[PDB]
Design an enzyme around this catalytic site. Structure first.
Site, PDB file in Angstrom:
ATOM      1  N   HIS A  23       0.794  -1.245   0.000  1.00 37.04           N
ATOM      2  CA  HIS A  23       0.000   0.000   0.000  1.00 37.04           C
ATOM      3  C   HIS A  23       0.829   1.300   0.000  1.00 37.04           C
ATOM      4  O   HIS A  23       0.309   2.379  -0.251  1.00 37.04           O
ATOM      5  CB  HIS A  23      -0.880  -0.006   1.246  1.00 37.04           C
ATOM      6  CG  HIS A  23      -1.586  -1.308   1.474  1.00 37.04           C
ATOM      7  ND1 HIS A  23      -2.581  -1.767   0.637  1.00 37.04           N
ATOM      8  CD2 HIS A  23      -1.425  -2.259   2.423  1.00 37.04           C
ATOM      9  CE1 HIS A  23      -3.018  -2.932   1.072  1.00 37.04           C
ATOM     10  NE2 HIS A  23      -2.329  -3.256   2.149  1.00 37.04           N
TER      11      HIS A  23
ATOM     12  N   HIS B  60       5.782   6.828   6.233  1.00 37.71           N
ATOM     13  CA  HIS B  60       5.444   6.349   4.919  1.00 37.71           C
ATOM     14  C   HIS B  60       4.887   7.512   4.104  1.00 37.71           C
ATOM     15  O   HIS B  60       4.736   8.624   4.621  1.00 37.71           O
ATOM     16  CB  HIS B  60       4.424   5.247   5.011  1.00 37.71           C
ATOM     17  CG  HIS B  60       3.129   5.693   5.578  1.00 37.71           C
ATOM     18  ND1 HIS B  60       2.868   5.695   6.928  1.00 37.71           N
ATOM     19  CD2 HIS B  60       2.055   6.231   4.979  1.00 37.71           C
ATOM     20  CE1 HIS B  60       1.656   6.177   7.132  1.00 37.71           C
ATOM     21  NE2 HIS B  60       1.147   6.515   5.960  1.00 37.71           N
TER      22      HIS B  60
ATOM     23  N   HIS C 293       2.199   8.958   0.599  1.00 39.25           N
ATOM     24  CA  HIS C 293       1.117   8.762  -0.320  1.00 39.25           C
ATOM     25  C   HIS C 293       1.449   9.669  -1.497  1.00 39.25           C
ATOM     26  O   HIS C 293       1.916  10.774  -1.289  1.00 39.25           O
ATOM     27  CB  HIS C 293      -0.220   9.190   0.289  1.00 39.25           C
ATOM     28  CG  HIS C 293      -0.581   8.461   1.540  1.00 39.25           C
ATOM     29  ND1 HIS C 293      -1.299   7.289   1.523  1.00 39.25           N
ATOM     30  CD2 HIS C 293      -0.295   8.703   2.846  1.00 39.25           C
ATOM     31  CE1 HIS C 293      -1.500   6.880   2.759  1.00 39.25           C
ATOM     32  NE2 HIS C 293      -0.848   7.683   3.570  1.00 39.25           N
TER      33      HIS C 293
ATOM     34  N   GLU D 125      -3.304  13.467   0.597  1.00 35.71           N
ATOM     35  CA  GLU D 125      -4.534  13.004   1.213  1.00 35.71           C
ATOM     36  C   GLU D 125      -5.262  14.226   1.753  1.00 35.71           C
ATOM     37  O   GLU D 125      -6.394  14.483   1.354  1.00 35.71           O
ATOM     38  CB  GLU D 125      -4.219  11.974   2.328  1.00 35.71           C
ATOM     39  CG  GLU D 125      -3.649  10.694   1.738  1.00 35.71           C
ATOM     40  CD  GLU D 125      -3.889   9.485   2.587  1.00 35.71           C
ATOM     41  OE1 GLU D 125      -3.557   9.507   3.786  1.00 35.71           O
ATOM     42  OE2 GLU D 125      -4.344   8.476   2.011  1.00 35.71           O
TER      43      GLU D 125
ATOM     44  N   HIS E 257       3.701  10.920   6.169  1.00 37.04           N
ATOM     45  CA  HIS E 257       3.061  10.693   7.443  1.00 37.04           C
ATOM     46  C   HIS E 257       4.038  10.060   8.433  1.00 37.04           C
ATOM     47  O   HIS E 257       4.542   8.942   8.206  1.00 37.04           O
ATOM     48  CB  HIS E 257       1.878   9.739   7.276  1.00 37.04           C
ATOM     49  CG  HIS E 257       0.711  10.357   6.593  1.00 37.04           C
ATOM     50  ND1 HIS E 257      -0.311   9.597   6.073  1.00 37.04           N
ATOM     51  CD2 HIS E 257       0.400  11.644   6.323  1.00 37.04           C
ATOM     52  CE1 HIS E 257      -1.203  10.393   5.515  1.00 37.04           C
ATOM     53  NE2 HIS E 257      -0.802  11.634   5.667  1.00 37.04           N
TER      54      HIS E 257
ATOM     55  N   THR F  85      -6.055   6.888   7.683  1.00 33.65           N
ATOM     56  CA  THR F  85      -6.529   7.005   6.306  1.00 33.65           C
ATOM     57  C   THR F  85      -6.494   5.673   5.536  1.00 33.65           C
ATOM     58  O   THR F  85      -6.877   5.637   4.377  1.00 33.65           O
ATOM     59  CB  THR F  85      -5.798   8.063   5.489  1.00 33.65           C
ATOM     60  OG1 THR F  85      -4.475   7.597   5.200  1.00 33.65           O
ATOM     61  CG2 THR F  85      -5.767   9.404   6.235  1.00 33.65           C
TER      62      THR F  85
HETATM   63  N1  LIG Z   1      -2.070   6.705   6.492  1.00 39.56           N
HETATM   64  S1  LIG Z   1      -2.120   6.516   8.052  1.00 39.56           S
HETATM   65  O1  LIG Z   1      -3.395   7.067   8.573  1.00 39.56           O
HETATM   66  O2  LIG Z   1      -0.893   7.129   8.649  1.00 39.56           O
HETATM   67  C1  LIG Z   1      -2.143   4.755   8.516  1.00 39.56           C
HETATM   68  C2  LIG Z   1      -0.815   4.094   8.390  1.00 39.56           C
HETATM   69  C3  LIG Z   1      -0.952   2.600   8.556  1.00 39.56           C
HETATM   70  C4  LIG Z   1      -0.938   1.985   9.929  1.00 39.56           C
HETATM   71  B1  LIG Z   1      -2.402   1.756  10.832  1.00 39.56           B
HETATM   72  B2  LIG Z   1      -2.187   0.216  11.657  1.00 39.56           B
HETATM   73  B3  LIG Z   1      -1.882   1.737  12.528  1.00 39.56           B
HETATM   74  B4  LIG Z   1      -0.130   2.010  12.585  1.00 39.56           B
HETATM   75  B5  LIG Z   1       0.674   0.658  11.762  1.00 39.56           B
HETATM   76  B6  LIG Z   1      -0.591  -0.462  11.183  1.00 39.56           B
HETATM   77  B7  LIG Z   1      -1.585   0.409   9.999  1.00 39.56           B
HETATM   78  B8  LIG Z   1       0.169   0.691  10.056  1.00 39.56           B
HETATM   79  B9  LIG Z   1       0.464   2.201  10.932  1.00 39.56           B
HETATM   80  B10 LIG Z   1      -1.106   2.740  11.386  1.00 39.56           B
HETATM   81  C5  LIG Z   1      -0.784   0.366  12.746  1.00 39.56           C
HETATM   82 ZN   LIG Z   2      -0.574   7.665   5.671  1.00 37.44          ZN
END
Ligand SMILES: [N]S(=O)(=O)[C][C][C]C1234B567B89%10B5%11%12B5%13%14B%15%16%17B8%18(B961B%18%152B5%163B%11%1374)C%10%12%14%17
Ligand SMILES: [Zn+2]
EC number: 4.2.1.1
Length: 257
Positions: free
Chosen positions: A61, A91, A93, A103, A116, A195
Site C-alpha cells: 500500500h 510512509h 502517499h 490526502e 506521514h 486514512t
Molecule cells: N495513512 S495513516 O493514517 O498514517 C495509517 C498508516 C498505517 C498503519 B495503521 B495500523 B496503525 B499504525 B501501523 B498499522 B496500519 B500501520 B500504521 B497505522 C498500525
Molecule cells: Zn498515511
C-alpha cells in the site's frame, strides 16, 4: 483484499470497515479561512535526535521506514498533545502525476505527495492498544511539492529499487528523519482517523503548513514501486491516497496567525 483500484479502492472500504462513514474520518480539506487560530496551542516538540531506524518495507500500500519504539528515542509532544508519542514509522502517499497524491488538501489544492510520521501514545503501552483509543495516535503530516531536491530524502530514494514489490524489505539503519522536516513547524490540527484500513478513529492529526520540495527524479522513483507481489502482473504503486472526507462536527485549529 483492500487497495486503491476501481474494485477495491476507497469507495469500497466501508463494506469491510463500516467506520469508513463515521463521524471523524480522515483525510479532510483544510479550508484555511475557516480554520481558527488557537493561541492556547503550544509549539510542537519534535525530538528525533536519538531516532533508530530499523527497516524499509513495501507493504503493498506504500513503503515505510520503521523505528525502534521500545523506548522514548524519537518522540512527539506539545502542540495539541497531552503526554508523549513515540515514532513507530513513516510512509508516503503519492500520485501518478504531480497534480494529485496528497490526502489532505488545502483550499482544495492537492500536493504531489504527503509524508506521514506515525506516533503512538506511550500511556497505552503498544500501538495495537493505542489504535483502540480516541487519543492513541498522533500523525504528523507533511506536504511534498515538486521543485528542488530534498537531500534528506535521497537515502530513501536510492534503496527503493530493492523493495520494488509487496513484501520486500531491507535494512535501513542510521536514517535521520529530521532531514525530512520543513523549516516551520506551524500547523493545523483536528481529530481524525487512520486514512487506510482499519480507518480507526484514534488519530490527532498535525498537518504542517509548509511543504517540503522534492525533485521530479525523487518522486519518479516512488512511482516505480509496485502494488503487486513479485511474479504478478505489474501494477504501479501510484495514487495510493484516500480522498478528502466529510468534516462533519469538527473544527480545524491553526497554531499560527
Ligand atoms: N495513512 S495513516 O493514517 O498514517 C495509517 C498508516 C498505517 C498503519 B495503521 B495500523 B496503525 B499504525 B501501523 B498499522 B496500519 B500501520 B500504521 B497505522 C498500525
Ligand atoms: Zn498515511
Amino acid at each position: 483484499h483492500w487497495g486503491y483500484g476501481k474494485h477495491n479502492g476507497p469507495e469500497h472500504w466501508h463494506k469491510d470497515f463500516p467506520i469508513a462513514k463515521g463521524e471523524r474520518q480522515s483525510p479532510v480539506d483544510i479550508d484555511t479561512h475557516t480554520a481558527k487560530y488557537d493561541p492556547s496551542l503550544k509549539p510542537l516538540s519534535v525530538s528525533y535526535d536519538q531516532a533508530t531506524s530499523l527497516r524499509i518495507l513495501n507493504n503493498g500500500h506504500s513503503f515505510q521506514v520503521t523505528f525502534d519504539d521500545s523506548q522514548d528515542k524519537a518522540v512527539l509532544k506539545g502542540g495539541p498533545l497531552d503526554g508523549t508519542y513515540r515514532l513507530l514509522q513513516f510512509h508516503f502517499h503519492w500520485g501518478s502525476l504531480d497534480g494529485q497524491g496528497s490526502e489532505h488538501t488545502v483550499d482544495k489544492k492537492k500536493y504531489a505527495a504527503e509524508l506521514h510520521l506515525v506516533h503512538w501514545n506511550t500511556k497505552y503501552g503498544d500501538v495495537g492498544k493505542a489504535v483502540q483509543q480516541p487519543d492513541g495516535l498522533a500523525v504528523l503530516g507533511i506536504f511534498l511539492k515538486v521543485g528542488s531536491a530534498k537531500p534528506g530524502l535521497q537515502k530513501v530514494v536510492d534503496v527503493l529499487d530493492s523493495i520494488k514489490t509487496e513484501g520486500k524489505s531491507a535494512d535501513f539503519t542510521n536514517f535521520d528523519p529530521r532531514g525530512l522536516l520543513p523549516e516551520s513547524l506551524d500547523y493545523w490540527t483536528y481529530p481524525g482517523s487512520l486514512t487506510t484500513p482499519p480507518l480507526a478513529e484514534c488519530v490527532t492529526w498535525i498537518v504542517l503548513k509548509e511543504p517540503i520540495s522534492v525533485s521530479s527524479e525523487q518522486v519518479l522513483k516512488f512511482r516505480k514501486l509496485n502494488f503487486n507481489g513479485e511474479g504478478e502482473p505489474e501494477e504501479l504503486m501510484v495514487d495510493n491516497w484516500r480522498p478528502a472526507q466529510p468534516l462533519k462536527n469538527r473544527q480545524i485549529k491553526a497554531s499560527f496567525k
